[PDB]
Design a protein around this ligand. Structure first.
Ligand SMILES: CN1CCN(C2CCN(C(=O)Nc3cc(Oc4ccc(NC(=O)C5(C(=O)Nc6ccc(F)cc6)CC5)c(F)c4)ccn3)CC2)CC1
Length: 273
């Protein structure tokens, strides 16, 4: 990661805040200034927290792709510590699609899915398994470009610092996670492809919550009994068929992300479907 000089960074507007810290909109001088998001580490912290905060930035900094959020740099030597990323004017996809209910064409929605799939193909080619692929972790810019991110919603601290038992390795998003990853913690790019099919269903419902009528255990039983998410209204058959292939029980049968990009490219270049 690049260390950013604090003089080059300006915070202008608060986007959100929690016990983790805060997120700001601001400007960065690379030398004209560019808009950025600025994630801060809350005071005070623990040396695992600070190393984990910086270590997550190190992971993000390894990637360079149009459909992966870009790391501009970090401030680690001064307080508050900061992760400084590319700015995404439309925020998280799930919220964006609920705000824009019914307002996009099918070709526009499929273009979003292609962008997500192209980001995931890059990650797969880097041997990176995301494990939390969901519309809430897809960011959207003004041009409607969709980019993969992982703010770390799965890794927030909710464990007492003195608890005998703690969560380790993060919590699991059951509604987005492939069955073999829930059962054996077998996380692979193939289990990310299952999650991608769930993202496809989020997009085509303009942000419905998957299995929303069902408790987390109600979801797991429904799945192993063979239930799959239903065909959204106005979802083309070819898109729903792609979803079902991502949700194949045997992971060796799911498409690879490279295949998903190609399938979506061909559809975009020739509707029908
Ligand atoms: C519709 N309008 C609503 C109000 N308003 C807002 C909406 C909310 N907005 C917003 O949230 N913008 C935004 C926030 C941002 O906050 C983040 C800050 C940091 C992160 N990511 C990270 O911290 C990490 C990460 O993403 N790692 C990572 C990345 C990619 C991978 F493949 C794996 C790990 C952990 C290092 C992140 F995913 C998001 C980033 C960029 N843009 C934009 C303006 C205008 C739009």
């Amino acid at each position: 990661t690049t260390e950013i000089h604090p003089s080059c960074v300006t915070r202008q507007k608060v986007i959100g805040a929690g016990e983790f810290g805060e997120v700001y909109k601001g400007m960065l001088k690379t030398s004209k200034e560019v808009p950025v998001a600025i994630k801060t580490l809350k005071a005070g912290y623990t040396e695992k927290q600070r190393v984990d905060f910086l270590g997550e930035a190190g992971i993000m900094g390894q990637f360079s792709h149009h459909n992966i959020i870009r790391l501009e740099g970090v401030i680690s030597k001064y307080k508050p510590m900061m992760i400084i990323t590319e700015y995404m004017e439309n925020g998280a996809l799930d919220k964006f699609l609920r705000e824009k209910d019914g307002e996009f064409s099918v070709l526009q929605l499929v273009g979003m899915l292609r962008g997500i799939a192209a980001g995931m193909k890059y990650l797969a080619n880097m041997n990176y398994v995301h494990r939390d692929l969901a519309a809430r972790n897809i960011l959207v810019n003004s041009n409607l470009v969709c980019k993969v991110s992982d703010f770390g919603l799965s890794r927030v601290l909710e464990d007492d610092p003195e608890a005998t038992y703690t969560t380790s390795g993060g919590k699991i998003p059951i509604r987005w996670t492939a069955p073999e990853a829930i059962s054996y913690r077998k996380f692979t790019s193939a289990s990310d492809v299952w999650s991608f099919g769930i993202v496809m269903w989020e997009v085509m419902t303009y942000g419905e919550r998957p299995y929303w009528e069902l408790s987390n255990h109600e979801v797991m039983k429904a799945i192993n009994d063979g239930f799959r998410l239903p065909t959204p209204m106005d979802c083309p058959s070819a898109i729903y068929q792609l979803m079902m292939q991502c949700w194949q029980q045997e992971r060796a049968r799911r498409p690879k992300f490279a295949d998903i990009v190609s399938i979506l490219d061909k559809l975009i270049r020739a509707p029908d479907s």
